[PDB]
Design a protein around this ligand. Structure first.
Ligand SMILES: *[C@@H]1O[C@H](CO)[C@@H](O[C@@H]2O[C@H](CO)[C@@H](O[C@@H]3O[C@H](CO[C@H]4O[C@H](CO)[C@@H](O)[C@H](O)[C@@H]4O)[C@@H](O)[C@H](O)[C@@H]3O)[C@H](O)[C@H]2NC(C)=O)[C@H](O)[C@H]1NC(C)=O
Ligand SMILES: *[C@@H]1O[C@H](CO)[C@@H](O[C@@H]2O[C@H](CO)[C@@H](O[C@@H]3O[C@H](CO)[C@@H](O)[C@H](O)[C@@H]3O)[C@H](O)[C@H]2NC(C)=O)[C@H](O)[C@H]1NC(C)=O
Ligand SMILES: *[C@@H]1O[C@H](CO)[C@@H](O[C@@H]2O[C@H](CO)[C@@H](O)[C@H](O)[C@H]2NC(C)=O)[C@H](O)[C@H]1NC(C)=O
Ligand SMILES: *[C@@H]1O[C@H](CO)[C@@H](O[C@@H]2O[C@H](CO)[C@@H](O)[C@H](O)[C@H]2NC(C)=O)[C@H](O)[C@H]1NC(C)=O
Ligand SMILES: *[C@@H]1O[C@H](CO)[C@@H](O[C@@H]2O[C@H](CO)[C@@H](O)[C@H](O)[C@H]2NC(C)=O)[C@H](O)[C@H]1NC(C)=O
Ligand SMILES: *[C@@H]1O[C@H](CO)[C@@H](O[C@@H]2O[C@H](CO)[C@@H](O)[C@H](O)[C@H]2NC(C)=O)[C@H](O)[C@H]1NC(C)=O
Ligand SMILES: CC(=O)N[C@@H]1[C@@H](O)[C@H](O)[C@@H](CO)O[C@H]1O
Ligand SMILES: *[C@@H]1O[C@H](CO)[C@@H](O)[C@H](O)[C@H]1NC(C)=O
Ligand SMILES: *[C@@H]1O[C@H](CO)[C@@H](O)[C@H](O)[C@H]1NC(C)=O
Ligand SMILES: *[C@@H]1O[C@H](CO)[C@@H](O)[C@H](O)[C@H]1NC(C)=O
Ligand SMILES: *[C@@H]1O[C@H](CO)[C@@H](O)[C@H](O)[C@H]1NC(C)=O
Ligand SMILES: *[C@@H]1O[C@H](CO)[C@@H](O)[C@H](O)[C@H]1NC(C)=O
Ligand SMILES: *[C@@H]1O[C@H](CO)[C@@H](O)[C@H](O)[C@H]1NC(C)=O
Ligand SMILES: *[C@@H]1O[C@H](CO)[C@@H](O)[C@H](O)[C@H]1NC(C)=O
Ligand SMILES: *[C@@H]1O[C@H](CO)[C@@H](O)[C@H](O)[C@H]1NC(C)=O
Lengths: 158, 1133, 158, 158
């Protein structure tokens, strides 16, 4: 029931927390705290949209959640989805105010069409996040470029 | 008496000063401030003019008046109380009673180091009643052009939040950036700790400030408003006529029934003349030369008199001269001659949408119609510039618009006169493209100026940030009604059409210059016709369109009638002589009448259009009667031939009949000397009538005889057929035509009621060419503007008091006009007026101005005035001085410098008493119909009478004059009622008297023929006012000809029936009509057979589609009645 | 890269920060921290709307930002703008939920019309803020009264 | 001018604050801080809607406010209101994003109709809160189940 906090010296990455942070460990400014978004792509992670959707699914009853992150990495593949329900209305919610596309994509799978939309929101089946511009959401937003990813919290040197 | 200040001291902020503290008595104002005090605070201008202000303070007060004037100037009472609030504060010799200094600071003279004291703030005790009355007088004033109250601009808040005391509080707060220092007001009608509030008398907006300053308007005030108009009259009868007709019918029916029940219960002189004629013939029957020799003489007289076929037809002279119509037109000339003509275009933008645009600083939504889109205005300006540049050539010379245009400010300004919305931008693309704006607002553009200029089109300076003039480049204002169409109320922004108008010289007295102008017009019409722009639909005024269309359209149809005329004369040729015996005669008969007519007219000078349809169709009378006399003799055959066989068959039926036919015809065309615009064509034909009569006398008979003695077989058959027909007719009459005769009477009755209970003047409807149509369509669509002038010429003008009285007349005329309306707008005038009496007044309160001589030279300014006390007097009366100054103007004098002159006056030397002729004109739109304009003219005459009837004097001396490009043209449609009644009446007497010149049966013949007069007329009227009919200068002539041919018919049937040797009940009648019936089917039938080719045929315009239309219908009805009428009369007898 | 913090004793305004706050300087409660909005008006500053707009301009691609402030001053001049694009739609964004007009204005230049609107948002060219009711925005909101201003952060005495 | 903070040992509820929190009182983690929502129902508190509305009223000029709370209690009676103005438009505002019905109700008075709606927002006349799903608002939201209640803030044992 506690979010891990990474502590780095020169290159010592020890997964600690304040449930350990030795009385010699120095946190002198809040500027030393950073959150980072890392991408989930590479070998064994399919890139084409038909294979990619297998990692996501529609679900109702679960409210979407957002968390900020301050830095991330260049993504080789990003996604940008637009989906009409069978009756023609919109399947994905509009991007909330201040949520912009993931800012550094080599390539964007930007696609549009219609589908069954069997739920209120599209989630990540592996429990990862959809990374937008320094905001990570549990959910896919309409016409908005994302990378798949996860977040870590760090203490940086002075 | 004590002051709190005197003179100006240090700077407060910007260019603004505090006044110097001073607590002594008021000081007599130096004489060099008397102009300022008279202007600003005349209430103080008496005695030693001892005031608590100096000249500097008064100058400062004047300089600061700009913004109150900006918004309140239009309502003098409102501005007056405000000025008094400031005058009392600034200058009152009892300041200390109502002002209390509350803050001060040192003032040091920079050169002397002497200290004085700035009055930094003071408290001003203002009457509660004064403040409320000041607000009351201003609260309805509307900003210059804006549905917003002027107070919304002077109160630091919107008008709905502005109150009396917060208005004064705001104006007096230095925070407003105008007041140099703060004055804190205290409002009380009661003394306050010994202070006596300023409670000066005030003027309401419904009161005059003084003798030369009127109350405020309705638009800018409330008190002086209402009431609207309530003089609408509603008439509507007619049912009465229907009831009467019905009643008559019922009566007839009853009579018939009664008749049915009964049947169930049970001359010498003429002879002598004939004999003489016969004798003559017998003599004549001994030589052909004589006859032909006489014909030859007629060949010459006819052609001879036709010398110089100068038979004119143009231009617009048919209303006839003399009388008032013409005399009135001539008069207006000597005073100015031809006011002028206009070439006018209506322009719409069919592919453009409306648009909105917020105008600073209001920001309210104002929609602008399609043609006021910025780009369409640029495109319309290019059209306009291109029109100005059009040139035509005449001989070897070049004709420009600048040679022929009204250029009111020539030579100093050759600028032509173009009434157009583009003249609000001085016809400049750049000026219109301008737009003072930044990253936040557009403060001024082509919209703001427009909304200002429609309210102040003479302005030489927009009040907005643009500061552009409204005045057109020709030196005068362009009134918005005259350049826009299809808008509601006075919301000129919602216009759906632009109107562009170029005045050009009519040159009524100069033939060589008019031809040049007409050459230019032709190029103008061509330019407009061929102008390519999908964004604009452009449609016409010019001159040829109305003169070229009639002369361009009225041609093709000619081939129609012409053809019909040939096919008809062919039959009438085959009929009798058939071979080459009768043909010759006719051709000569028709020629004789036509040729003789032209000759008879050439001896007096004359010509015309319809004068042709009458001449041709009129010739029928000669052919008809001439075609029956020969046919009758053909049916002859007894113990004689040539000798007595010709005199016994000619001087027996041709003597009486012809003798009576010739007279009845000459009486209709002869007495045609009446008063109107048709006597020419009429008489000429009537004269040609006796001629044609005397011609076929020994010419036809002799020729027919001299030569008369397969073809034979054909003639016999025709004769036989005729005989058979006659027999049939007799049989029909034998049975009993009492029932149908009564029915016929009903038809005539119903016709009289239906024809007498309709009417109409006459409109303009030419073929569907193009140009004419455009002008007609545009006029129908447009509205509000496009004009004519009502105009008065007046004499004397020397008694200051009579001028005041004439001004009251003039102002009263402007009222009624701006009131009299119909449907959803006014009908009478327009309307409004700009004589000059107002110009003089303006000058009295205005200044001088600069005149810049052309091409170069030093500036000249010269003038003066004459106030204060004198100012009011000067304006009130005397006029030589004012007049001689006012006629010479071309540069305003005040905040700008433009042109505001005119014309109409022309005295000699400095004899101002001999001034003529002031002329006021209010242009009113109509373009509804021939009856519409005629109705408006009817009103204007009564208007002229009312004005002249109000205050007259001595015998005669000029009066009202309504000269509108529609009068003289419609002036005829005026006395049309008396004409028809008089024209036909004259014929009724000449016919009844003639038919008695060889009979006089009291009620017999008299009634017989007399009955034909009203018998046929009811038919002509019915068809005219009934079905596809009409009426006008022509239709009137049409009715005349109708009565003519009608007389012809009746005349023959009756002159041989009335007598009846071996007399009987109704047997002798059937016998006579028999020998007369054969001819009734010959000429008549044929004549109709010809019209059909003319009527039943086709054409390329409704013009003749009616003229020759009723002809056939009216002519047919008359013919039918001929047989029936006679039969019914015989029965009655 | 650090927001200045003002420290006041009785009248000593020393522009310090916690990058200096002496070990004798007393911060005993978060109630001692205040943010203040100060107005930019007076001599030289175009008090009239045509001159005032010269300080503002339209720009696209920059997301609006808001920061709260707890106290400000009476403004002699405020502004309240409404602007239609040429096609009639709205040029300025509606005031977001909870953003009300600047609360203390002697006078409001309240104006409405149409203009070119050559950008998504209207900003301050001098880098100042539009002050609303205890919220300062980088941007102008439709029909909402603002004063132009800047923000400071202070430590108040106990 | 200070929000009370409740301190509990085993069962000692002393209404203290940090304006007292003895130098022996232990706050070692932010996880010890909890806010709780308690219900206002029971004897003397009427349950039928006509009697219940007497505790609420419409008011304009006052902006709605929301505060979170982390735990509450089962409610015997909840309310869920939908109200049309006389002109047919909506009288109560829609529930803002993330505001769901009170999660534990024995019974919901769920009612709908039309009424005078003489104000912008419906408030609690006794100054209590409308409790939704772990958010407490000063105001009633359309079609959203609430319990009436109040909030306390506590320090829990380690
Ligand atoms: C007859 O009409 C003519 C035009 O139809 C009159 O001359 C026209 O005058 C206008 C106004 O100047 C010319 O427009 C141009 O003006 C610019 C400069 O703009 C200036 O605007 C005003 C004064 O003009 C001033 O406040 C500004 O400071 C600017 O200096 C010039 O750069 C252009 O050359 C041009 O003159 C028209 O071009 C001009 N038309 C012609 C045909 O020259 C003329 O005055 C009228 N005649 C009489 C007797 O009134
Ligand atoms: C023709 O011109 C007339 C003006 O005589 C136009 O009437 C105007 O209509 C507008 C609405 O389009 C009125 O403005 C209104 O303001 C209220 C409140 O600010 C707002 O709620 C409306 O939406 C509208 O903007 C304006 O007051 C009114 N002008 C007058 C005369 O009072 C008319 O719309 C034009 N229509 C044609 C002939 O095309
Ligand atoms: C304010 O009212 C006073 C009183 O009516 C005006 O003073 C009078 O002005 C008339 C006109 O010149 C004189 O005949 C009187 O002798 C004046 N009476 C007194 C008592 O001075 C005064 O003109 C008004 N103020 C203004 C600015 O018009
Ligand atoms: C109209 O003018 C009156 C003053 O003559 C203004 O007066 C006060 O009204 C305001 C509310 O608008 C109150 O707060 C003040 O206490 C009132 N003062 C007094 C002495 O009555 C009034 O506000 C103005 N109203 C408008 C719309 O301009
Ligand atoms: C009719 O109106 C159109 C629209 O104003 C004119 O065409 C041009 O419009 C295009 C598209 O907006 C612009 O890019 C051009 O600037 C316009 N043309 C020019 C030459 O500037 C068109 O010119 C108008 N037709 C005529 C005959 O004037
Ligand atoms: C039109 O009149 C306006 C009146 O406001 C003039 O604008 C200013 O007038 C004041 C006089 O009070 C001058 O002191 C200013 O210099 C004028 N403005 C400018 C820009 O100088 C304006 O000069 C007039 N213009 C014309 C062409 O008549
Ligand atoms: C009876 C009558 O009115 N006569 C007057 C006469 O007194 C006057 O001299 C003349 C002036 O033109 O006008 C007339
Ligand atoms: C001013 O003139 C008045 C009469 O108009 C006179 O009574 C008074 O004595 C004069 N006062 C002075 C100082 O001239
Ligand atoms: C003027 O009025 C003020 C109060 O507003 C008072 O204090 C002062 O003494 C008065 N001065 C005179 C000369 O009346
Ligand atoms: C008077 O003014 C002069 C400047 O003209 C200055 O030199 C001098 O010091 C001043 N003296 C007094 C009386 O203050
Ligand atoms: C001016 O105000 C009076 C009362 O103060 C009012 O009776 C009158 O109608 C007002 N003037 C108008 C509106 O004509
Ligand atoms: C007509 O023109 C001639 C000169 O061509 C002139 O003498 C005469 O006065 C003019 N007529 C009128 C009515 O002005
Ligand atoms: C006007 O005519 C002149 C002839 O000199 C020509 O040069 C010019 O192009 C024309 N401008 C137009 C077509 O408006
Ligand atoms: C035009 O007329 C002039 C005389 O006015 C003559 O000299 C010239 O040759 C003529 N030119 C033409 C083309 O007729
Ligand atoms: C003409 O004026 C008289 C009064 O002189 C008036 O009775 C009548 O109504 C007016 N008629 C018209 C048509 O103006």
């Amino acid at each position: 029931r506690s979010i891990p906090l990474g502590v780095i010296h020169n290159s010592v990455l020890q997964v600690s927390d304040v449930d350990k942070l030795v009385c010699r460990d120095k946190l002198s400014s809040t500027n030393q705290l950073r959150s980072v978004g890392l991408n989930l792509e590479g070998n064994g992670v399919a890139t084409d949209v038909p294979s990619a959707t297998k990692r996501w699914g529609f679900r109702s009853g679960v409210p979407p959640k957002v968390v900020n992150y301050e830095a991330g990495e260049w993504a080789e593949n990003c996604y940008n989805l637009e989906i009409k329900k069978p009756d023609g209305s919109e399947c994905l919610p509009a991007a909330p105010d201040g949520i912009r596309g993931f800012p550094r994509c080599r390539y964007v799978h930007k696609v549009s069409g219609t589908g069954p939309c069997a739920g209120d929101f599209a989630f990540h089946k592996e429990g990862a996040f959809f990374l937008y511009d320094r905001l990570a959401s549990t959910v896919i937003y309409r016409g908005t470029t994302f990378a798949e990813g996860v977040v870590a919290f760090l203490i940086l040197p002075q | 008496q004590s002051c709190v200040w005197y003179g100006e001291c240090g700077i407060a902020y910007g260019d603004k000063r505090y006044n110097c503290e001073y607590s002594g008595p008021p000081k007599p104002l130096p004489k060099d401030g008397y102009d300022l005090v008279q202007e600003l605070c005349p209430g103080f201008f008496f005695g030693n003019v001892s005031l608590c202000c100096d000249v500097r303070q008064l100058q400062t007060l004047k300089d600061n008046l700009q913004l109150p004037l900006q918004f309140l100037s239009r309502c003098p009472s409102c501005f007056y109380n405000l000025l008094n609030l400031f005058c009392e504060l600034t200058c009152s010799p009892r300041q200390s009673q109502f002002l209390n200094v509350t803050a001060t600071e040192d003032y040091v003279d920079p050169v002397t180091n002497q200290t004085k004291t700035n009055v930094k703030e003071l408290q001003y005790y203002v009457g509660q009643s004064f403040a409320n009355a000041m607000y009351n007088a201003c609260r309805d004033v509307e900003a210059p052009s804006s549905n917003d109250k002027a107070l919304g601009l002077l109160c630091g808040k919107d008008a709905d939040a502005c109150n009396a005391t917060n208005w004064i509080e705001y104006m007096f707060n230095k925070d407003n950036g105008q007041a140099p220092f703060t004055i804190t007001p205290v409002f009380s009608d009661f003394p306050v700790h010994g202070m006596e509030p300023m409670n000066n008398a005030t003027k309401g907006c419904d009161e005059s400030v003084d003798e030369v300053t009127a109350p405020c308007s309705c638009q800018d005030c409330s008190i002086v408003c209402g009431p609207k108009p309530q003089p609408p009259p509603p008439p509507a009868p007619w049912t009465i006529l229907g009831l009467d007709a019905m009643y008559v019918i019922m009566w007839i029916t009853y009579m018939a029934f009664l008749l049915v029940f009964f049947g169930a219960f049970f001359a010498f002189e003429g002879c002598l003349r004939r004999l003489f004629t016969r004798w003559g013939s017998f003599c004549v029957r001994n030589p052909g030369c004589v006859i032909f020799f006489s014909l030859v003489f007629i060949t010459a007289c006819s052609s001879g008199l036709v010398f110089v076929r100068v038979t004119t037809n143009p231009v617009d002279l048919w209303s006839a001269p003399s009388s008032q119509a013409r005399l009135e037109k001539e008069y207006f000339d000597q005073h100015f001659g031809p006011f002028f003509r206009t070439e006018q275009l209506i322009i719409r933008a069919p592919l453009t949408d409306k648009h909105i645009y917020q105008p600073y600083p209001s920001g309210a939504d104002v929609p602008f119609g399609p043609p006021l889109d910025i780009q369409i205005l640029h495109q319309v300006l290019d059209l306009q510039i291109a029109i100005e540049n059009i040139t035509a050539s005449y001989d070897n010379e070049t004709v420009t618009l600048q040679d022929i245009c009204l250029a009111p400010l020539s030579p100093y300004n050759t600028n032509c006169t173009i009434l157009s919305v583009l003249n609000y931008f001085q016809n400049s693309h750049s000026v219109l493209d301008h737009k003072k704006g930044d990253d936040f607002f557009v403060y001024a553009d082509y919209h703001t100026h427009f909304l200002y200029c429609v309210r102040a089109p003479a302005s030489l300076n927009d009040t907005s940030l643009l500061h552009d003039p409204c005045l057109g480049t020709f030196g005068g204002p362009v009134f918005p009604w005259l350049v826009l169409g299809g808008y509601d109320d006075q919301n000129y922004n919602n216009a759906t059409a632009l109107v562009i108008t170029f005045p050009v010289n009519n040159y009524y007295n100069d033939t060589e210059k008019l031809q040049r102008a007409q050459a230019w017009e032709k190029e103008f019409i061509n330019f407009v016709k061929n102008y390519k722009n999908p964004n604009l639909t452009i449609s016409f005024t010019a001159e040829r369109s109305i003169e070229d269309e009639l002369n361009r359209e009225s041609d093709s149809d000619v081939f129609t009638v012409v053809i019909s005329y040939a096919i008809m004369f062919l039959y009438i040729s085959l009929a009798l002589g058939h071979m080459k015996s009768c043909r010759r005669l006719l051709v000569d008969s028709k020629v004789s009448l036509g040729i003789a007519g032209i000759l008879i007219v050439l001896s007096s000078v004359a010509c015309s259009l319809g004068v042709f349809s009458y001449i041709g169709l009129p010739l029928t009378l000669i052919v008809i009667e001439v075609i029956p006399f020969l046919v009758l003799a053909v049916g002859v055959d007894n113990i004689f031939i040539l000798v007595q066989a010709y005199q016994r068959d000619e001087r027996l039926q041709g003597e009486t009949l012809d003798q009576q036919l010739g007279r009845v015809l000459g009486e209709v065309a002869p007495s045609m000397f009446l008063s109107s615009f048709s006597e020419t064509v009429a008489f000429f034909l009537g004269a040609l009538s006796v001629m044609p009569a005397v011609h076929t006398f020994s010419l036809f008979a002799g020729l027919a005889v001299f030569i008369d003695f397969a073809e034979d077989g054909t003639s016999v058959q025709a004769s036989e057929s005729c005989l058979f027909r006659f027999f049939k007719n007799s049989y029909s009459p034998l049975l009993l035509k009492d029932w149908m005769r009564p029915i016929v009477i009903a038809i005539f009755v119903g016709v009289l009621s239906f024809s007498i209970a309709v009417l109409n003047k006459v409109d303009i409807g030419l073929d569907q060419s193009l140009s004419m149509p455009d002008d007609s369509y545009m006029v129908d669509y447009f509205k509000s503007i496009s004009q004519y002038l009502h105009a008065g010429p007046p004499v004397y003008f020397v008694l200051e008091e009579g001028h005041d009285y004439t001004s009251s007349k003039g102002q009263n005329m402007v009222c009624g006009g701006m009131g009299c309306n119909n449907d959803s707008l006014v009908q009478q005038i327009f309307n409004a007026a700009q004589l000059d009496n107002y110009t003089r007044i303006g000058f009295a309160p205005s200044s001088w101005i600069d005149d810049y001589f052309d091409w170069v030279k030093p500036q000249s300014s010269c003038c003066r005035v004459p106030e204060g006390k004198q100012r009011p007097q000067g304006g009130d009366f005397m006029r030589f001085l004012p007049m001689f100054l006012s006629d010479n103007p071309n540069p305003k004098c005040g905040k700008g410098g433009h042109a505001a002159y005119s014309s109409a006056v022309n005295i000699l030397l400095g004899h101002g008493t001999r001034v003529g002729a002031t002329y006021f004109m209010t242009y009113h739109t109509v373009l509804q119909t021939s009856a519409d304009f005629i109705d408006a003219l009817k009103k204007a005459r009564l208007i002229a009478s009312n004005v002249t009837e109000t205050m007259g004097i001595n015998g005669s001396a000029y009066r009202v004059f309504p000269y509108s490009v529609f009068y003289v043209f419609y002036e005829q449609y005026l006395t049309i009622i008396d004409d028809t009644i008089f024209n036909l009446g004259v014929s009724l007497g000449a016919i009844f008297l003639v038919t008695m010149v060889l009979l006089g049966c009291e009620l017999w013949s008299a009634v017989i023929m007399c009955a034909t007069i009203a018998m046929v007329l009811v038919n002509m009227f019915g068809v005219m006012w009934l079905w596809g009919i009409s009426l006008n200068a022509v239709s009137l002539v049409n009715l005349v000809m109708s009565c003519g041919i009608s007389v012809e018919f009746c005349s023959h049937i009756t002159r041989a029936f009335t007598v009846s040797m071996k007399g009987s009940r109704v047997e002798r009648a059937e016998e006579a009509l028999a020998h007369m019936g054969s001819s009734v089917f010959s000429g008549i039938t044929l004549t109709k057979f010809g019209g059909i080719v003319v009527l039943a045929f086709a054409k390329s315009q409704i013009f003749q589609i009616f003229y020759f239309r009723m002809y056939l219908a009216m002519v047919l009805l008359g013919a039918t009645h001929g047989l029936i009428f006679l039969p019914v009369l015989l029965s009655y007898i």
